Amino acid sequence: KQQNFCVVELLPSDPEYNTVASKFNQTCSHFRIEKIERIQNPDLWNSYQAKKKTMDAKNGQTMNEKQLFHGTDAGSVPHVNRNGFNRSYAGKNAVAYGKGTYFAVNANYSANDTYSRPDANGRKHVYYVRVLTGIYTHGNHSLIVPPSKNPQNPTDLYDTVTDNVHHPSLFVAFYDYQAYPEYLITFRK
Numbered sequence: 001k002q003q004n005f006c007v008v009e010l011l012p013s014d015p016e017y018n019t020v021a022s023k024f025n026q027t028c029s030h031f032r033i034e035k036i037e038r039i040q041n042p043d044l045w046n047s048y049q050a051k052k053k054t055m056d057a058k059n060g061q062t063m064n065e066k067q068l069f070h071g072t073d074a075g076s077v078p079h080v081n082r083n084g085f086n087r088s089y090a091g092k093n094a095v096a097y098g099k100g101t102y103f104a105v106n107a108n109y110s111a112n113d114t115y116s117r118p119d120a121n122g123r124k125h126v127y128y129v130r131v132l133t134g135i136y137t138h139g140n141h142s143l144i145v146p147p148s149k150n151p152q153n154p155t156d157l158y159d160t161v162t163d164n165v166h167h168p169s170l171f172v173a174f175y176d177y178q179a180y181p182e183y184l185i186t187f188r189k
């Protein structure tokens, strides 16, 4: 499957725009939003929804999905809109909590120039992503996949890892189709 996509601009009058902007402005109200775009990728959406169905059927009462932030440079925007946050993604970091893609609870973390690098025109880019966090544990630098939940069953693993299990600020996703880049926020200092 090709995973062809379309990019649709949201009007400030749309209730979806106010929902996205309000969440972004909880920690980044000092920045100015230029535009919010919706990413429409049917094959990526279908593979994401299939993984969500499998996760919902095994985790009981757990609310398996969260909406998190991810800053990236302008050059990565066409790669993310097509493939999401896969193995070939340039922003795959091997840092403190494992080798995978990092997502922030608060936009201010993603709004750092190291993550959302300003382009030639001074525009910064942060995605508002649907992430299947599921059941998570504390991460470590050696991880390339999540740890096993039970030492007796090394087959059943955690869904993601975090920096702090009871008060998280970050999540690390290790698999393809575990995150959908629904909205793209373009803003400046």
Ligand SMILES: Cc1ccc2c(=O)[nH]c(CSc3ncccn3)nc2c1C
Pocket: 069, 070, 071, 072, 073, 076, 090, 091, 092, 093, 095, 102, 103, 104, 109, 110, 115, 170
């Ligand atoms: C802890 C954390 C929290 C948020 C982000 C984030 O929002 N982004 C990235 C990498 S984004 C990228 N990396 C390289 C080239 C182009 N884009 N790391 C992050 C990290 C390491």
